[PDB]
Amino acid sequence: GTSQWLRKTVDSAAVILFSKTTCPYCKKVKDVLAEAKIKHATIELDQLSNGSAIQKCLASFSKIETVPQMFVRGKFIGDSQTVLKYYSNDELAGIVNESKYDYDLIVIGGGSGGLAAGKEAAKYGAKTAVLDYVEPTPIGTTWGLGGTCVNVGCIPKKLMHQAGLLSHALEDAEHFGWSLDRSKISHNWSTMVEGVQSHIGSLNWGYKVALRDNQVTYLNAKGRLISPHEVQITDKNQKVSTITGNKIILATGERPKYPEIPGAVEYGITSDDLFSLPYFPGKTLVIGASYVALECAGFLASLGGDVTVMVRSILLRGFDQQMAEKVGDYMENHGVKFAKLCVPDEIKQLKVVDTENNKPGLLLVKGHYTDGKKFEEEFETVIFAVGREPQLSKVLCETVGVKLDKNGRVVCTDDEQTTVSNVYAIGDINAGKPQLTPVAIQAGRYLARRLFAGATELTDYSNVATTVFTPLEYGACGLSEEDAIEKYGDKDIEVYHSNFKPLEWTVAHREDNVCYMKLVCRKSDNMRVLGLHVLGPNAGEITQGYAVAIKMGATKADFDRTIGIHPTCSETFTTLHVTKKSGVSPIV
Amino acid sequence: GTSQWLRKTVDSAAVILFSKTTCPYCKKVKDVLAEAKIKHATIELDQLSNGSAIQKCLASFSKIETVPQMFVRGKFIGDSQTVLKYYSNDELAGIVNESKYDYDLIVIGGGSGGLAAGKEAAKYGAKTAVLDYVEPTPIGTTWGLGGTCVNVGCIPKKLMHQAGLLSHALEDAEHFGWSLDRSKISHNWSTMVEGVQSHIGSLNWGYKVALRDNQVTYLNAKGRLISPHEVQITDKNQKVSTITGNKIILATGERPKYPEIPGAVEYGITSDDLFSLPYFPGKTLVIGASYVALECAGFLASLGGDVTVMVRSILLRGFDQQMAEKVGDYMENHGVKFAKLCVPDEIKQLKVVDTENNKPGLLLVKGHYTDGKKFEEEFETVIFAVGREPQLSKVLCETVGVKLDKNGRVVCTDDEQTTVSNVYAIGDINAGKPQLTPVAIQAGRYLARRLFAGATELTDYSNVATTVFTPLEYGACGLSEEDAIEKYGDKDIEVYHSNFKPLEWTVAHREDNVCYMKLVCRKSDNMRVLGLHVLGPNAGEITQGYAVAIKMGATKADFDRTIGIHPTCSETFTTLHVTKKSGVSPIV
Ligand SMILES: Cc1cc2nc3c(=O)[nH]c(=O)nc-3n(C[C@H](O)[C@H](O)[C@H](O)COP(=O)(O)OP(=O)(O)OC[C@H]3O[C@@H](n4cnc5c(N)ncnc54)[C@H](O)[C@@H]3O)c2cc1C
Ligand SMILES: Cc1cc2nc3c(=O)[nH]c(=O)nc-3n(C[C@H](O)[C@H](O)[C@H](O)COP(=O)(O)OP(=O)(O)OC[C@H]3O[C@@H](n4cnc5c(N)ncnc54)[C@H](O)[C@@H]3O)c2cc1C
Ligand SMILES: OCCN1CCN(CCO)CC1
Ligand SMILES: OCCN1CCN(CCO)CC1
């Protein structure tokens, strides 16, 4: 296995030094390379348990068993005397730059995963290019470098959520003694958008600086993989050229889906448009029941808007359905209207958007309920949040041999390798994986280290915690209650649960017995915690730390023996005692 | 060991049933006892690995080896036929009520620990009395049932902290698009206090109802332990009587210290007075540098007050001093003045408090700095926060034989037992233990289960997480960096750290590179996490979950392999990479 690891590492690293921490010759070479500004990976064999075996195995590549040993792109370059010879003869720069390809790595896609992968690879001397292109939405919306999360996802979404949370902060402040006249307080959408967009702009710019400062080539160009090592690029001017790369990372993400009904593309918008919308949405219909749908509906209602969500069947399919119902119940009790068991048939235009005065248009939405009654109501804005999908036939020619599944996502090994052995895929287009920004980042950074620094660590995609930033937030890590029961059987599952009330809600006169948490546990495995679920404020902060404990195999006894921090919401996880099977009420 | 456990369990339980989950005779007895409203502990031997040994060992108490076996106060009462005989002859109630003592348990002190202990004990049939008396402060302040945290500690402190946090919420709201005129917004102290006190009142009342509903006797009386089983009580009317108890729990807590300087008792106040203060403090001097001092100074300044903290030497002695300095720096940058290296000499009165119009008085504080310069400044309110101390010579006669340490705290075994074998101590008066409400609660609940339900589980007092609710909150779990270095040596310690910026602070134009976190790790123990530290918003929610992982022995690798929740503050713990020894800046 050492041999297989070493051969893969040598074949793939751009520039790599096999070293020992206590060798002056190893240090001679490192100082030369640093002085010449030559970035490289380093493997200190005296820090590896099988370093002595690695050292002997190196002779199969270099005919020598000593350190240091320098490799470039699979070729043994030399020991210390040889490296210094190249340097003193001004030959070293040419040696370390020789490649069959323009780049060691081409990343197609400049989002959460691709930027993380490209930046990390460049640290080890990989000559890296990152391609990013944002295809405009149907109304023409585009944005800068950084991907979905930065421009039209997690970042603006949570900032507008915070704008919404500040509404309840204004309400609460009076009860806590602050003297303010709410009846003169209103929200200005475009002032909020301008602040959000200024921050996004600082991220776009920061990423461009980051890539420059790491000697990564950034091309604002659409990339298309035409053969395993050839990426055809089309720039702003429609100029087409081809660049070649040793390793390719596909990191192209997804875009919103539209339903195939008249008027949807012409008159509706998606989340891609919402976060830079130059007019206030006004009275809004959200069609959809995903976390995007409910998050957007939620903050729009807390900003004072007249909001309706059209739900075909259930909320948050794939999430714990008890929690999903509690999430939606809170929203309905706090101003969000729900058109349940309802689907849209047609969007018709009644007024065009006012580009000069930044006012929405007006739309007539026709639909129908399962009981046969018709839905017909006017809205100023209609947001479709009915799923997202990859768009790879734009990005890889069918002839390259990269296998997709029936949803168009890339079929990968557990080390992100596609069916084309130099081509990898990370982030939302990697089939089967949780579609989250920190997953994409960990996947890309860890992959880059395996490709170019000899690492072995894989990304662990199990028990990845999430938070839905609805008006009352929902954090989760692990299995839903229903999935646990399906997998292990009802008799092997114990669920501990409790309502709770944040201390902050007491003086503010908010609800008893609405915030809620539970631990879904496996009886036959020492009451192992299979799933953790919390509905309450700051739910992402609550949940995150428990994800470490769940990764480590926490049991109910581990939660019990831990002491709470008081007064917090999270501490209630350390004193749960009511089981669902007991039938005792969880209210407090 | 089974024999020692069984003998202790039988001797101590008030009413206990040795049972098997699948015995109809065991169920006959349980239904009788439930019908007769006889509360008891139950031990299901068929759920214990050594139940068959326990079953045989029971014959040494009962001459029989079958289940069920019922015991009362150390006496075998009978099998099923005998218990039913007592019931059918109307003799059972008398049997289960016979005791050498008025109570199975007397709790002296109705605070966090004592209420938790008393309520839990009563669940197992322990006839329980809880005594609580609040000695008035020097200005006459008193309050109701529930202890320090409920009335004059964690609960009002965090509510006033929230009032302070809402100030920054009003500031932020404008940047997020809300239109409000701050120049007409002010804070009303007494409106806030009235809300806080209404909540506290609901807790006082809830505890009284809770005790009634659990058949606990609540005596609003000062208790004094005069012999191992005799508690002398003095009621509101100065009527003195004696009650007897089998087990005694001392749970009497501490009160604020005053320095011995002229005017301190006459003209200053403490936290005991602050949380119900009927006048606004106005321009305030806090003398002290504890978490109480800094928490109180912090919220008073965020409510708009003119606040100074007088610091003799350092902040937060006993806490990580890097974090303490960052905590204080934030406060100084946000309106809190610090009189450093300064001590008070004299408080003189310039105006008496206005009891009719609810306005503060006025005080002249004279003090001196270490460089010899004099301190002389006027304040409307002076708060002493210079430590807390037990007051047990009021509570136990010296002749009883309960050993105290040199600070007046009770010297306990690891199961809370004092040097008097039926007398236990929990909470703040238990020497050496973290002085926190959830510790007191876990200690009392777990002790009650050992005394009256045959449990063996001890309270684990190690790595107890904390949060200081200063304007920028500070959460911690485990060792300070300096304590780790002292214990293991600098060469065995690695510290990973980073600044961060909450997403909520971006649009709000708050500080870069002020929030901060670190993991203090042990190199020779697989990079075990010895201490976790975070300065930032919602720090108690951030910290809590990690305390489970630290309890389980988390390493740096366990943090790394866990995926972040984005966007949160807490996720930065999952991607730390800068070490202090590297010298690389932690800024971001
Ligand atoms: C509204 C919304 C809210 C969200 N909120 C959260 C949240 O709170 N927390 C969380 O963890 N996740 C959240 N997500 C998910 C997160 O945004 C994605 O998981 C993440 O962005 C995926 O990263 P990626 O690198 O796979 O793709 P992306 O970030 O989508 O980046 C892919 C980039 O490649 C570009 N591209 C596509 N094709 C090409 C091509 N041929 N050539 C060049 N460039 C191309 C794309 O235009 C894009 O810029 C949210 C998503 C949405 C839509
Ligand atoms: C300002 C302040 C803020 C705090 N904030 C926090 C925080 O945020 N989180 C946290 O975990 N901890 C906090 N604490 C600590 C917490 O309050 C204590 O750890 C906790 O209250 C100790 O509980 P206890 O049961 O030991 O004693 P107490 O809660 O003090 O209860 C003891 C009771 O016994 C009464 N008593 C005393 N003698 C007698 C007697 N002879 N007879 C009858 N009754 C008697 C006392 O008057 C009191 O009512 C704070 C403390 C203070 C002062
Ligand atoms: O989109 C469906 C995602 N789904 C929700 C999160 N789940 C994990 C937490 O319970 C798993 C899958
Ligand atoms: O009052 C001193 C308390 N002190 C602070 C908390 N510490 C633990 C977290 O680092 C331990 C002790």
Side-chain angles (χ1 to χ4, degrees):
Chain A
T2 294
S3 299
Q4 281 184 34
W5 166 84
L6 183 60
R7 139 164 45 95
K8 169 194 278 173
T9 295
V10 166
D11 282 347
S12 184
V15 188
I16 189 161
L17 183 68
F18 291 89
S19 179
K20 284 180 168 170
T21 62
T22 39
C23 175
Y25 287 119
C26 291
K27 196 181 186 301
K28 223 191 296 294
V29 171
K30 289 166 166 173
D31 293 343
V32 166
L33 299 174
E35 172 170 274
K37 298 269 170 61
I38 298 176
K39 300 183 293 186
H40 61 93
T42 303
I43 287 172
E44 307 290 0
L45 299 175
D46 75 302
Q47 302 181 340
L48 301 174
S49 57
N50 60 334
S52 48
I54 295 166
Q55 190 154 347
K56 200 183 179 183
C57 205
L58 279 166
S60 297
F61 305 76
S62 64
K63 291 177 188 275
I64 59 162
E65 303 184 65
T66 56
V67 290
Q69 295 193 36
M70 187 174 176
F71 292 79
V72 171
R73 300 188 180 91
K75 276 186 165 82
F76 171 64
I77 294 311
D79 59 15
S80 57
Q81 176 162 326
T82 295
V83 171
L84 268 59
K85 181 270 182 182
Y86 291 147
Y87 193 53
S88 63
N89 285 258
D90 285 12
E91 295 162 343
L92 183 58
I95 295 288
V96 301
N97 292 333
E98 191 170 24
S99 174
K100 288 185 281 181
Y101 309 108
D102 300 316
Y103 301 94
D104 291 296
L105 171 65
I106 298 172
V107 180
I108 310 184
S112 291
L115 289 168
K119 217 181 295 180
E120 185 73 12
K123 290 177 63 174
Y124 308 110
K127 180 100 178 296
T128 300
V130 171
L131 315 186
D132 192 59
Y133 170 71
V134 173
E135 183 177 346
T137 72
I139 64 171
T141 306
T142 189
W143 51 83
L145 180 67
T148 290
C149 180
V150 164
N151 291 286
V152 293
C154 353
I155 295 303
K157 170 284 281 309
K158 208 200 184 191
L159 288 167
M160 298 191 179
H161 175 57
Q162 175 67 4
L165 291 174
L166 287 161
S167 181
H168 309 295
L170 297 173
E171 294 162 337
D172 288 357
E174 328 204 65
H175 297 292
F176 281 88
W178 291 97
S179 79
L180 66 71
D181 188 3
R182 270 219 59 105
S183 86
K184 296 196 215 294
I185 299 181
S186 58
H187 181 79
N188 187 297
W189 170 264
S190 285
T191 296
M192 181 189 66
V193 173
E194 286 298 310
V196 169
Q197 289 296 327
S198 186
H199 178 62
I200 292 174
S202 84
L203 298 176
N204 300 148
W205 177 76
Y207 284 121
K208 280 191 276 185
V209 174
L211 291 192
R212 184 185 50 63
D213 287 353
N214 281 266
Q215 292 100 340
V216 174
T217 295
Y218 165 50
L219 300 179
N220 183 27
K222 184 188 171 61
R224 180 167 145 88
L225 188 66
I226 59 169
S227 77
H229 296 279
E230 298 174 293
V231 178
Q232 180 201 268
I233 53 169
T234 309
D235 72 14
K236 57 159 207 239
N237 302 328
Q238 293 302 294
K239 180 178 166 197
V240 182
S241 57
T242 295
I243 60 174
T244 63
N246 186 19
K247 312 300 183 190
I248 309 294
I249 293 173
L250 305 175
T252 48
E254 301 183 324
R255 300 292 292 273
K257 296 199 241 187
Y258 287 77
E260 301 197 309
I261 64 168
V265 175
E266 297 90 340
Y267 309 132
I269 63 168
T270 73
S271 57
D272 278 2
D273 306 300
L274 181 62
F275 295 119
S276 69
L277 205 65
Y279 56 89
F280 54 92
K283 182 185 173 191
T284 296
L285 177 68
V286 183
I287 295 171
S290 62
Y291 76 88
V292 174
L294 298 180
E295 288 176 347
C296 291
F299 66 71
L300 288 173
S302 297
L303 297 174
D306 176 346
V307 180
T308 304
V309 179
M310 190 178 285
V311 183
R312 181 161 58 179
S313 57
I314 66 179
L315 301 185
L316 297 177
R317 181 173 301 276
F319 291 83
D320 185 292
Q321 283 294 290
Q322 176 192 29
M323 304 303 293
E325 182 172 41
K326 291 183 180 295
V327 161
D329 282 353
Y330 185 87
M331 293 174 64
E332 193 163 30
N333 288 333
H334 288 274
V336 182
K337 298 174 292 305
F338 285 86
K340 296 159 177 159
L341 300 177
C342 193
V343 302
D345 296 306
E346 209 192 336
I347 317 293
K348 179 190 171 193
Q349 182 169 244
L350 308 178
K351 297 193 195 180
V352 174
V353 169
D354 185 341
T355 289
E356 279 185 340
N357 292 317
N358 289 320
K359 312 184 113 169
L362 184 67
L363 306 165
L364 179 69
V365 176
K366 292 180 88 159
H368 64 274
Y369 297 93
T370 57
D371 66 5
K373 286 161 194 154
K374 303 280 116 166
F375 176 101
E376 181 172 333
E377 185 166 0
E378 294 179 3
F379 298 91
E380 295 181 286
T381 294
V382 177
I383 307 174
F384 292 98
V386 297
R388 294 167 61 76
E389 62 186 354
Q391 275 130 61
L392 278 173
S393 59
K394 285 172 177 148
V395 178
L396 26 76
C397 300
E398 57 159 68
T399 65
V400 180
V402 173
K403 179 177 182 64
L404 310 179
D405 72 8
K406 59 167 166 68
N407 305 321
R409 295 186 187 89
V410 186
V411 182
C412 298
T413 72
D414 65 14
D415 69 328
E416 287 76 58
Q417 195 182 48
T418 76
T419 49
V420 180
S421 305
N422 68 294
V423 181
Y424 298 74
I426 61 176
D428 288 356
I429 63 173
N430 187 325
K433 308 305 186 298
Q435 296 186 310
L436 303 163
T437 275
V439 173
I441 290 170
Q442 182 115 327
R445 287 184 181 156
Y446 280 25
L447 173 60
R449 293 172 190 172
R450 295 199 303 278
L451 288 172
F452 299 118
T456 52
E457 178 96 328
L458 304 176
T459 293
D460 181 354
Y461 294 97
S462 67
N463 294 313
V464 172
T466 56
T467 294
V468 177
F469 294 98
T470 34
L472 195 58
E473 297 175 3
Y474 167 37
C477 178
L479 296 175
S480 67
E481 181 169 334
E482 55 269 44
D483 283 355
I485 288 169
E486 172 70 25
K487 198 177 312 289
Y488 297 112
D490 183 58
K491 295 295 125 85
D492 200 24
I493 297 298
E494 190 85 287
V495 181
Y496 299 89
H497 67 159
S498 190
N499 286 117
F500 60 99
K501 184 177 201 175
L503 181 56
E504 292 74 25
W505 285 21
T506 61
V507 169
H509 307 288
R510 298 188 177 277
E511 300 99 307
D512 305 324
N513 299 315
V514 166
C515 298
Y516 178 82
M517 58 172 61
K518 65 177 178 182
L519 294 174
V520 180
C521 300
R522 187 172 175 199
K523 295 185 181 190
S524 70
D525 187 24
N526 208 12
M527 215 59 81
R528 197 77 54 189
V529 173
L530 300 179
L532 174 152
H533 300 271
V534 53
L535 175 72
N538 305 310
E541 308 301 350
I542 296 173
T543 299
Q544 172 75 89
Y546 293 110
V548 183
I550 290 164
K551 179 63 63 193
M552 294 167 69
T555 65
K556 181 53 161 55
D558 294 317
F559 278 68
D560 290 343
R561 63 195 182 111
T562 302
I563 304 304
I565 304 172
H566 183 65
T568 65
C569 296
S570 186
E571 64 176 317
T572 296
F573 271 117
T574 71
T575 57
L576 299 170
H577 67 280
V578 174
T579 67
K580 285 195 175 178
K581 284 208 218 281
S582 75
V584 171
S585 171
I587 72 181
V588 288
Chain B
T2 294
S3 299
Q4 281 184 34
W5 166 84
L6 183 60
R7 139 164 45 95
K8 169 194 278 173
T9 295
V10 166
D11 282 347
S12 184
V15 188
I16 189 161
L17 183 68
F18 291 89
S19 179
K20 284 180 168 170
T21 62
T22 39
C23 175
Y25 287 119
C26 291
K27 196 181 186 301
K28 223 191 296 294
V29 171
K30 289 166 166 173
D31 293 343
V32 166
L33 299 174
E35 172 170 274
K37 298 269 170 61
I38 298 176
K39 300 183 293 186
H40 61 93
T42 303
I43 287 172
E44 307 290 0
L45 299 175
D46 75 302
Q47 302 181 340
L48 301 174
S49 57
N50 60 334
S52 48
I54 295 166
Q55 190 154 347
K56 200 183 179 183
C57 205
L58 279 166
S60 297
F61 305 76
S62 64
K63 291 177 188 275
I64 59 162
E65 303 184 65
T66 56
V67 290
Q69 295 193 36
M70 187 174 176
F71 292 79
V72 171
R73 300 188 180 91
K75 276 186 165 82
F76 171 64
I77 294 311
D79 59 15
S80 57
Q81 176 162 326
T82 295
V83 171
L84 268 59
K85 181 270 182 182
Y86 291 147
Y87 193 53
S88 63
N89 285 258
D90 285 12
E91 295 162 343
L92 183 58
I95 295 288
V96 301
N97 292 333
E98 191 170 24
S99 174
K100 288 185 281 181
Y101 309 108
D102 300 316
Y103 301 94
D104 291 296
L105 171 65
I106 298 172
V107 180
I108 310 184
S112 291
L115 289 168
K119 217 181 295 180
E120 185 73 12
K123 290 177 63 174
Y124 308 110
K127 180 100 178 296
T128 300
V130 171
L131 315 186
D132 192 59
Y133 170 71
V134 173
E135 183 177 346
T137 72
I139 64 171
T141 306
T142 189
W143 51 83
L145 180 67
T148 290
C149 180
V150 164
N151 291 286
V152 292
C154 353
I155 295 303
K157 170 284 281 309
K158 208 200 184 191
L159 288 167
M160 298 191 179
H161 175 57
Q162 175 67 4
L165 291 174
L166 287 161
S167 181
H168 309 295
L170 297 173
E171 294 162 337
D172 288 357
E174 328 204 65
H175 297 292
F176 281 88
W178 291 97
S179 79
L180 66 71
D181 188 3
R182 270 219 59 105
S183 86
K184 296 196 215 294
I185 299 181
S186 58
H187 181 79
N188 187 297
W189 170 264
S190 285
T191 296
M192 181 189 66
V193 173
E194 286 298 310
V196 169
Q197 289 296 327
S198 186
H199 178 62
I200 292 174
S202 84
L203 298 176
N204 300 148
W205 177 76
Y207 284 121
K208 280 191 276 185
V209 174
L211 291 192
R212 184 185 50 63
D213 287 353
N214 281 266
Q215 292 100 340
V216 174
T217 295
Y218 165 50
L219 300 179
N220 183 27
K222 184 188 171 61
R224 180 167 145 88
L225 188 66
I226 59 169
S227 77
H229 296 279
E230 298 174 293
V231 178
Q232 180 201 268
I233 53 169
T234 309
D235 72 14
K236 57 159 207 239
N237 302 328
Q238 293 302 294
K239 180 178 166 197
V240 182
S241 57
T242 295
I243 60 174
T244 63
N246 186 19
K247 312 300 183 190
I248 309 294
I249 293 173
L250 305 175
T252 48
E254 301 183 324
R255 300 292 292 273
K257 296 199 241 187
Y258 287 77
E260 301 197 309
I261 64 168
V265 175
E266 297 90 340
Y267 309 132
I269 63 168
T270 73
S271 57
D272 278 2
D273 306 300
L274 181 62
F275 295 119
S276 69
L277 205 65
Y279 56 89
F280 54 92
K283 182 185 173 191
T284 296
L285 177 68
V286 183
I287 295 171
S290 62
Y291 76 88
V292 174
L294 298 180
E295 288 176 347
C296 291
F299 66 71
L300 288 173
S302 297
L303 297 174
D306 176 346
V307 180
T308 304
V309 179
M310 190 178 285
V311 183
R312 181 161 58 179
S313 57
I314 66 179
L315 301 185
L316 297 177
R317 181 173 301 276
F319 291 83
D320 185 292
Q321 283 294 290
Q322 176 192 29
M323 304 303 293
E325 182 172 41
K326 291 183 180 295
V327 161
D329 282 353
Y330 185 87
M331 293 174 64
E332 193 163 30
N333 288 333
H334 288 274
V336 182
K337 298 174 292 305
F338 285 86
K340 296 159 177 159
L341 300 177
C342 193
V343 302
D345 296 306
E346 209 192 336
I347 317 293
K348 179 190 171 193
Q349 182 169 244
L350 308 178
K351 297 193 195 180
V352 174
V353 169
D354 185 341
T355 289
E356 279 185 340
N357 292 317
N358 289 320
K359 312 184 113 169
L362 184 67
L363 306 165
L364 179 69
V365 176
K366 292 180 88 159
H368 64 274
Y369 297 93
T370 57
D371 66 5
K373 286 161 194 154
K374 303 280 116 166
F375 176 101
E376 181 172 333
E377 185 166 0
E378 294 179 3
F379 298 91
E380 295 181 286
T381 294
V382 177
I383 307 174
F384 292 98
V386 297
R388 294 167 61 76
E389 62 186 354
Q391 275 130 61
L392 278 173
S393 59
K394 285 172 177 148
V395 178
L396 26 76
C397 300
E398 57 159 68
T399 65
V400 180
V402 173
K403 179 177 182 64
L404 310 179
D405 72 8
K406 59 167 166 68
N407 305 321
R409 295 186 187 89
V410 186
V411 182
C412 298
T413 72
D414 65 14
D415 69 328
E416 287 76 58
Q417 195 182 48
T418 76
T419 49
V420 180
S421 305
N422 68 294
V423 181
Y424 298 74
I426 61 176
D428 288 356
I429 63 173
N430 187 325
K433 308 305 186 298
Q435 296 186 310
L436 303 163
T437 275
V439 173
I441 290 170
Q442 182 115 327
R445 287 184 181 156
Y446 280 25
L447 173 60
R449 293 172 190 172
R450 295 199 303 278
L451 288 172
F452 299 118
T456 52
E457 178 96 328
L458 304 176
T459 293
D460 181 354
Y461 294 97
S462 67
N463 294 313
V464 172
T466 56
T467 294
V468 177
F469 294 98
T470 34
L472 195 58
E473 297 175 3
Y474 167 37
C477 178
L479 296 175
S480 67
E481 181 169 334
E482 55 269 44
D483 283 355
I485 288 169
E486 172 70 25
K487 198 177 312 289
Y488 297 112
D490 183 58
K491 295 295 125 85
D492 200 24
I493 297 298
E494 190 85 287
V495 181
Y496 299 89
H497 67 159
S498 190
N499 286 117
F500 60 99
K501 184 177 201 175
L503 181 56
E504 292 74 25
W505 285 21
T506 61
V507 169
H509 307 288
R510 298 188 177 277
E511 300 99 307
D512 305 324
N513 299 315
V514 166
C515 298
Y516 178 82
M517 58 172 61
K518 65 177 178 182
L519 294 174
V520 180
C521 300
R522 187 172 175 199
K523 295 185 181 190
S524 70
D525 187 24
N526 208 12
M527 215 59 81
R528 197 77 54 189
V529 173
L530 300 179
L532 174 152
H533 300 271
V534 53
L535 175 72
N538 305 310
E541 308 301 350
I542 296 173
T543 299
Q544 172 75 89
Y546 293 110
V548 183
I550 290 164
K551 179 63 63 193
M552 294 167 69
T555 65
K556 181 53 161 55
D558 294 317
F559 278 68
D560 290 343
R561 63 195 182 111
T562 302
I563 304 304
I565 304 172
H566 183 65
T568 65
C569 296
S570 186
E571 64 176 317
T572 296
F573 271 117
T574 71
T575 57
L576 299 170
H577 67 280
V578 174
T579 67
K580 285 195 175 178
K581 284 208 218 281
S582 75
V584 171
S585 171
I587 72 181
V588 288

